């Protein structure tokens, strides 16, 4: 008999465990939750959380973007809880020393040839338990087909949301609403 809001008992919104049945990812988390709990460094606490993320937050960073975040800071190990893709536009790949979950086989060839080390996360623990002189990165989350559609809903004044439309070009959602000559602009 308490005047309490929800008598909370209030839950936490973020994910509380690993969802994968991938056994290697589970053992990765067991490492980095021993290492988070015991070591005290905030690097390991963040890496633990980012390991448990779903696929759309483990988004691929290109080799050419990974150059330019790591530009002034050449010595430091470039961590990315995520995948690493080759940039085809990048002609001469810079050497770096990357850690990540997964390299595509082009990007593994391109770094290793260019004089450039290519680590897993369990190897990063042996070198750098604290995360001393590392660079956390992550690929942009809101940069995909699906996330163009979100926001204020396309027929409202000054939204930049895409409509869900079956096909492109005229004859599809380009008349009443989109022209002033057809009723109204909005």
């Amino acid at each position: 008999g308490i005047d309490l809001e929800r008598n909370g008992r209030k839950k936490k919104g973020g994910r509380r465990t690993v969802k994968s049945q991938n056994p290697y990812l589970r053992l990765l988390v067991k490492l980095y939750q021993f290492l988070a709990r015991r070591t005290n460094s905030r690097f390991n606490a963040v890496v633990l959380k980012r390991l448990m993320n779903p696929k759309r937050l483990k988004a691929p960073m290109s080799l050419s973007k990974l150059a330019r975040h790591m530009k002034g800071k050449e010595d430091h190990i470039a961590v990315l809880v995520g995948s690493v893709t080759d940039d085809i536009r990048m002609v001469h790949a810079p050497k770096l020393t990357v850690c990540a979950l997964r390299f595509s086989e082009t990007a593994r060839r391109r770094l290793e040839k260019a004089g450039g080390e290519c680590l897993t996360f369990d190897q990063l623990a042996l070198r750098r338990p604290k995360g001393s002189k590392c660079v956390l990165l992550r690929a942009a989350t809101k940069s995909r087909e699906a996330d163009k559609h979100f926001g204020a809903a396309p027929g409202t004044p000054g939204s930049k949301a895409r409509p869900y439309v079956r096909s492109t070009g005229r004859k599809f959602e380009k008349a009443r609403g989109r022209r002033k000559s057809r009723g109204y602009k909005n």
Binding site: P23, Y24, R26, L27, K30
Partner: protein
């Protein structure tokens, strides 16, 4: 090779698991307790061992083991060793020594079982 990786395959399912209500038990040789954990179980762990009454009408005890540092791991004839022991309080001391060479951590439960085992003949 890895104990934890083999476990994350076979923890939930294997030939041995035998359930009733919340209980589960594990019928393999290389297993003190017959509980299904990472520590005790045969299958998964590096250097497992069992204490079983020997199968000769059950007159005497076996200590069943593997060669240390997983030597002959791919050759399961050669890997699995046996030592026969007589049922007594006196030959507890030989068994207590032989266990702690392989595994120091499993030593209290060996003393628990070996005491129980002596009391066991078909």
């Amino acid at each position: 090779v890895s104990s934890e990786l083999l476990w994350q395959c076979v923890r939930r399912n294997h030939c041995f698991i035998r359930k009733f209500n919340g209980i589960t038990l594990s019928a393999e040789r290389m297993n003190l307790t017959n509980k299904n954990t990472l520590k005790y179980s045969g299958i998964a762990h590096k250097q497992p061992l069992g204490l079983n009454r020997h199968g000769a009408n059950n007159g005497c005890i076996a200590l069943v083991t593997v060669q240390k540092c997983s030597r002959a791991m791919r050759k399961p004839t050669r890997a699995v060793q046996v030592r026969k022991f007589k049922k007594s309080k006196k030959e507890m001391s030989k068994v207590m020594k032989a266990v702690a060479e392989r595994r120091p951590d499993l030593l209290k439960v060996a003393n628990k079982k070996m005491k129980k085992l002596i009391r066991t003949n078909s």
